[PDB]
Scaffold this active site. Structure first.
Site, PDB file in Angstrom:
ATOM      1  N   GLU B  24    -134.121 -66.600  53.016  1.00 40.78           N
ATOM      2  CA  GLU B  24    -133.094 -66.639  52.212  1.00 40.78           C
ATOM      3  C   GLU B  24    -131.835 -66.045  53.594  1.00 40.78           C
ATOM      4  O   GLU B  24    -132.314 -64.905  54.337  1.00 40.78           O
ATOM      5  CB  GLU B  24    -132.599 -65.448  51.168  1.00 40.78           C
ATOM      6  CG  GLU B  24    -131.495 -64.419  50.465  1.00 40.78           C
ATOM      7  CD  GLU B  24    -131.189 -64.201  49.836  1.00 40.78           C
ATOM      8  OE1 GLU B  24    -132.040 -63.950  48.176  1.00 40.78           O
ATOM      9  OE2 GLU B  24    -130.156 -63.248  49.569  1.00 40.78           O
ATOM     10  N   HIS B  26    -128.560 -65.083  53.833  1.00 42.07           N
ATOM     11  CA  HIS B  26    -127.727 -64.425  53.417  1.00 42.07           C
ATOM     12  C   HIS B  26    -126.639 -63.782  53.951  1.00 42.07           C
ATOM     13  O   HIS B  26    -124.522 -63.975  54.071  1.00 42.07           O
ATOM     14  CB  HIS B  26    -127.451 -63.704  51.565  1.00 42.07           C
ATOM     15  CG  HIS B  26    -126.215 -63.507  50.612  1.00 42.07           C
ATOM     16  ND1 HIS B  26    -126.816 -62.820  49.611  1.00 42.07           N
ATOM     17  CD2 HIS B  26    -125.363 -63.945  50.933  1.00 42.07           C
ATOM     18  CE1 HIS B  26    -125.196 -63.113  49.315  1.00 42.07           C
ATOM     19  NE2 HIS B  26    -124.261 -63.792  49.706  1.00 42.07           N
ATOM     20  N   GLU B  69    -129.774 -67.910  49.267  1.00 44.68           N
ATOM     21  CA  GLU B  69    -128.707 -68.090  49.952  1.00 44.68           C
ATOM     22  C   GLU B  69    -128.567 -68.485  51.281  1.00 44.68           C
ATOM     23  O   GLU B  69    -128.662 -67.176  51.716  1.00 44.68           O
ATOM     24  CB  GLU B  69    -128.095 -66.268  49.077  1.00 44.68           C
ATOM     25  CG  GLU B  69    -127.673 -66.967  47.674  1.00 44.68           C
ATOM     26  CD  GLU B  69    -127.478 -65.412  47.064  1.00 44.68           C
ATOM     27  OE1 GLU B  69    -127.897 -64.215  47.213  1.00 44.68           O
ATOM     28  OE2 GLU B  69    -126.590 -65.177  46.514  1.00 44.68           O
ATOM     29  N   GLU B 145    -128.760 -69.062  37.946  1.00 46.72           N
ATOM     30  CA  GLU B 145    -128.715 -67.303  37.672  1.00 46.72           C
ATOM     31  C   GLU B 145    -127.295 -67.647  36.984  1.00 46.72           C
ATOM     32  O   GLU B 145    -126.179 -68.219  37.263  1.00 46.72           O
ATOM     33  CB  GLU B 145    -128.261 -66.044  39.117  1.00 46.72           C
ATOM     34  CG  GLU B 145    -129.555 -66.865  39.774  1.00 46.72           C
ATOM     35  CD  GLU B 145    -129.418 -65.391  41.397  1.00 46.72           C
ATOM     36  OE1 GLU B 145    -128.475 -64.764  41.659  1.00 46.72           O
ATOM     37  OE2 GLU B 145    -130.217 -66.409  42.602  1.00 46.72           O
ATOM     38  N   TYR B 146    -127.427 -66.209  35.833  1.00 48.27           N
ATOM     39  CA  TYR B 146    -126.108 -65.913  35.341  1.00 48.27           C
ATOM     40  C   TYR B 146    -125.921 -65.246  34.603  1.00 48.27           C
ATOM     41  O   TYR B 146    -127.173 -64.837  34.300  1.00 48.27           O
ATOM     42  CB  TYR B 146    -126.157 -67.743  34.388  1.00 48.27           C
ATOM     43  CG  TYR B 146    -126.656 -67.445  33.020  1.00 48.27           C
ATOM     44  CD1 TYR B 146    -128.122 -67.995  33.219  1.00 48.27           C
ATOM     45  CD2 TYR B 146    -126.096 -67.284  31.555  1.00 48.27           C
ATOM     46  CE1 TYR B 146    -129.263 -68.173  32.071  1.00 48.27           C
ATOM     47  CE2 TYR B 146    -127.008 -67.978  30.667  1.00 48.27           C
ATOM     48  CZ  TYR B 146    -128.303 -67.896  30.554  1.00 48.27           C
ATOM     49  OH  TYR B 146    -129.095 -67.690  29.471  1.00 48.27           O
ATOM     50  N   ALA B 147    -125.111 -64.822  33.257  1.00 52.11           N
ATOM     51  CA  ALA B 147    -125.217 -63.563  32.528  1.00 52.11           C
ATOM     52  C   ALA B 147    -125.602 -62.050  33.780  1.00 52.11           C
ATOM     53  O   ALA B 147    -126.921 -61.723  33.019  1.00 52.11           O
ATOM     54  CB  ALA B 147    -125.704 -63.623  31.345  1.00 52.11           C
ATOM     55  N   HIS B 148    -125.193 -61.400  34.376  1.00 56.02           N
ATOM     56  CA  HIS B 148    -125.679 -60.265  35.069  1.00 56.02           C
ATOM     57  C   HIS B 148    -125.638 -59.603  34.519  1.00 56.02           C
ATOM     58  O   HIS B 148    -125.569 -58.805  33.955  1.00 56.02           O
ATOM     59  CB  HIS B 148    -124.472 -60.256  36.487  1.00 56.02           C
ATOM     60  CG  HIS B 148    -124.793 -59.828  37.708  1.00 56.02           C
ATOM     61  ND1 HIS B 148    -125.054 -58.660  37.941  1.00 56.02           N
ATOM     62  CD2 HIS B 148    -126.261 -59.529  38.678  1.00 56.02           C
ATOM     63  CE1 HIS B 148    -125.550 -57.895  38.578  1.00 56.02           C
ATOM     64  NE2 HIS B 148    -126.768 -58.691  39.320  1.00 56.02           N
ATOM     65  N   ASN B 205    -126.414 -49.073  52.743  1.00 61.02           N
ATOM     66  CA  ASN B 205    -126.772 -49.156  51.697  1.00 61.02           C
ATOM     67  C   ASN B 205    -126.147 -49.855  49.915  1.00 61.02           C
ATOM     68  O   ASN B 205    -125.253 -49.192  49.833  1.00 61.02           O
ATOM     69  CB  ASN B 205    -127.915 -47.801  51.155  1.00 61.02           C
ATOM     70  CG  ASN B 205    -126.942 -46.952  50.197  1.00 61.02           C
ATOM     71  OD1 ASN B 205    -126.295 -46.830  49.231  1.00 61.02           O
ATOM     72  ND2 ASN B 205    -127.465 -46.347  50.598  1.00 61.02           N
ATOM     73  N   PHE B 209    -126.427 -51.560  43.149  1.00 60.97           N
ATOM     74  CA  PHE B 209    -126.781 -52.889  42.327  1.00 60.97           C
ATOM     75  C   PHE B 209    -128.310 -53.647  42.570  1.00 60.97           C
ATOM     76  O   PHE B 209    -127.944 -54.837  42.496  1.00 60.97           O
ATOM     77  CB  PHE B 209    -125.650 -53.290  43.473  1.00 60.97           C
ATOM     78  CG  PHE B 209    -124.980 -55.076  43.891  1.00 60.97           C
ATOM     79  CD1 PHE B 209    -124.649 -55.600  42.555  1.00 60.97           C
ATOM     80  CD2 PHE B 209    -125.537 -55.716  44.805  1.00 60.97           C
ATOM     81  CE1 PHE B 209    -124.096 -57.139  42.117  1.00 60.97           C
ATOM     82  CE2 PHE B 209    -125.278 -57.180  44.135  1.00 60.97           C
ATOM     83  CZ  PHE B 209    -124.649 -57.294  42.895  1.00 60.97           C
TER      84      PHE B 209
HETATM   85 NA    NA Z   1    -128.642 -56.759  43.030  1.00 59.97          NA
END
Ligand code: NA
Ligand SMILES: O=C1O[C@H](CO)[C@H](O)[C@H](O)[C@H]1O
Ligand SMILES: [Mg+2]
Ligand code: NA
Lengths: 210, 211
Positions: B24, B26, B69, B145-148, B205, B209
Site C-alpha cells: 500500500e 496511498h 491503494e 470495502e463498503y458500509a463504513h 495524526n 479515523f
Molecule cells: Na480508517
C-alpha cells in the site's frame, strides 16, 4: 372496368391480430404506373463511411428487366440542391459471384463523396439520387430517384450508434388512425402528427405494428 | 498476509478468505508513483510471490489480492499475470486505479454507492448497479470495502443487500470494518480508557479515523 372483390377475413387475418379497430376495404391509394419494356426493376442505395465520417462511398445497385443489350447503361448522379456533387456511369454486368458467373442484368455504381452532410433527426440533411436507365449514346429510357440520407446505423460495444454517436430514443408508437376516416391516412394528418411530435421533443416513431 | 493460524481457523470454521499482498502506497502523489516504476517491481513482486508460495494450499483462500491503494501501475499487470500463471485455481482482484483495471478479475470498488454515482475524474465510483452494465463490462462486482461503520453508522446498509439479492452479478462485499483500532491507556487512578489518534503525542495524526 376494374372489379375488386375484397374479403374481410382470410388466412391473412391470423397474422393481423393487432390491438386496434378491425376494419376492411381499399384503405390506401390505387394507382396506374407505366414502365418501359426495358426498365429499372429495382435499386438499392447504401452509404459507407471512414472512421471520422469525413469520407463516404455511395453504392447503388441497380437491377433491370427486359431486353439486355451492350448499349444499355445506368447513370447515378447525386445532388445537393441544384448542385451535382457526384456521378457515375456504367454498363450492365455485375462482378462474378459464383461458378456460373454474375448478374448480367445488374450493375453497381460507386460514388465518392467528401465531407458529406450527415442525416439525423437533429439535422435531416438529404441528397437527391437520380437513377437513369439509358443508351450509351445519350437516350434516356427511364429514370427513378429517391432522397438519400448519409447516415451509419450500427451497434458497437453494446450501444446503438448513429453516425458514431450513442442515440437516446425519445420515441412513441403511432398507429394510422383518424376519428372520421378510420385507417385511411392523408398528408395533412401525417404532417400534423410529425409537427406535434417534434414540437413535444420526440425524435423517433415505431410503425406499430405494420 | 495474516498470522499463519488465521487461515487454518478459516479452513476449519468455514469462511471465504481474500489473501492480500502487503503493498500500500496511498501517500504517494500520484498514488501509482512507485507501482508504475519498474525499479520497485522487485520489492513488490516479493510481497506477492512469497504470499502465494505460503498460503496456496489453504482452501479458505479463494481470491488473491495485489494489495491496497497503490493506484494502478505496470507492476500490477505483471504481478497479476504472474499469479494467473502459477495458480489458475483462484481469481485475482485489485481495486487501485479505478476498481476495474486490467489487473483485476473482479470489479471491486470501495464505497461505490448503490444508486448514486460519484463521477470522480479518472477514477469514478459508479453506482454499483450502473457499473455492471457499462459498455463492454462483463465481470462480477464485489465491493472490497463498503458500509463504513465509523461510530454511529451503517445507515442505508439494507439498500446494498436489496441490490445484492436482485442483481446476479452484484455478489456482495466486505464491510469496513470489523474492529475499532483503539488502544488502551490508563489515567492517574489506573483506570483504563480507549485511545485513538494523537493520544500518544503522535502528530500529525488522524484522530478517531482509526475506529
Ligand atoms: Na480508517
Ligand atoms: O403490448 C401491447 O400493449 C398495448 C396496450 O394498449 C397494445 O395492445 C400494443 O399493440 C401491444 O403490443
Ligand atoms: Mg396485441
Ligand atoms: Na447478486
Amino acid at each position: 372496368r376494374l372489379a375488386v372483390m375484397v374479403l374481410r377475413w382470410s388466412d391473412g387475418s391470423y397474422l393481423e391480430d393487432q390491438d386496434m379497430w378491425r376494419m376492411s376495404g381499399i384503405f390506401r391509394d390505387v394507382s396506374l404506373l407505366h414502365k418501359p419494356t426495358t426498365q429499372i426493376s429495382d435499386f438499392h442505395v447504401a452509404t459507407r463511411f471512414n472512421d471520422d465520417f469525413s469520407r463516404a462511398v455511395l453504392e447503388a445497385e441497380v437491377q433491370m428487366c427486359g431486353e439486355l443489350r451492350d448499349y444499355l447503361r445506368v447513370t447515378v448522379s447525386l445532388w445537393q440542391g441544384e448542385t451535382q456533387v457526384a456521378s457515375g456511369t456504367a454498363p450492365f454486368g455485375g462482378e462474378i459471384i459464383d461458378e456460373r458467373g454474375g448478374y448480367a442484368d445488374r450493375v453497381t455504381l460507386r460514388l465518392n463523396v467528401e465531407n458529406p452532410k450527415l442525416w439525423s433527426a437533429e439535422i435531416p440533411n438529404l441528397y437527391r439520387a437520380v437513377v437513369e436507365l439509358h443508351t450509351a449514346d445519350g437516350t434516356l429510357i427511364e429514370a427513378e430517384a429517391c432522397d438519400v440520407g448519409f447516415r451509419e446505423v450500427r451497434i458497437e460495444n453494446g450501444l446503438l450508434l448513429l453516425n458514431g454517436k450513442p442515440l437516446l430514443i425519445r420515441g412513441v408508437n403511432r398507429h394510422e388512425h383518424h376519428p372520421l376516416h378510420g385507417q385511411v391516412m392523408d398528408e395533412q394528418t401525417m404532417v400534423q402528427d410529425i409537427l406535434l411530435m417534434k414540437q413535444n421533443n420526440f425524435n423517433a416513431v415505431r410503425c406499430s405494428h405494420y | 498476509p495474516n498470522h499463519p493460524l488465521w487461515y487454518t481457523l478459516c479452513d476449519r470454521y468455514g469462511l471465504y478468505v481474500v489473501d492480500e499482498a502487503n503493498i500500500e502506497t496511498h501517500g504517494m502523489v500520484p498514488m501509482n508513483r512507485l507501482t508504475d516504476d519498474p525499479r520497485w517491481l522487485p520489492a513488490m513482486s516479493e510481497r506477492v510471490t512469497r504470499m502465494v508460495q505460503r498460503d496456496r494450499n489453504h482452501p479458505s483462500v479463494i481470491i488473491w489480492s495485489l494489495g491496497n491503494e497503490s493506484g494502478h501501475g505496470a507492476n500490477h499487470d505483471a504481478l497479476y499475470r504472474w499469479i494467473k500463471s502459477v495458480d489458475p485455481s483462484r481469481p485475482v482482484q485489485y481495486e487501485g486505479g479505478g476498481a476495474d483495471t486490467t489487473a483485476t478479475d473482479i470489479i471491486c470498488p470501495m464505497y461505490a454507492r448503490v444508486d448514486e454515482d460519484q463521477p470522480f475524474p479518472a477514477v469514478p465510483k459508479w453506482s454499483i448497479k450502473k457499473w455492471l452494465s457499462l459498455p463492454g463490462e462483463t465481470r462480477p462486482l464485489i465491493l472490497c470495502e463498503y458500509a463504513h461503520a465509523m461510530g454511529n453508522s451503517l445507515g442505508g446498509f439494507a439498500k446494498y443487500w436489496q441490490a445484492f439479492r436482485q442483481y446476479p452479478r452484484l455478489q456482495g462485499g466486505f464491510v469496513w470494518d470489523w474492529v475499532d483500532q483503539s488502544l488502551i491507556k490508563y489515567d492517574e487512578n489506573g483506570n483504563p480508557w480507549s485511545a485513538y489518534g494523537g493520544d500518544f503525542g503522535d502528530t500529525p495524526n488522524d484522530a478517531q479515523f482509526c475506529m
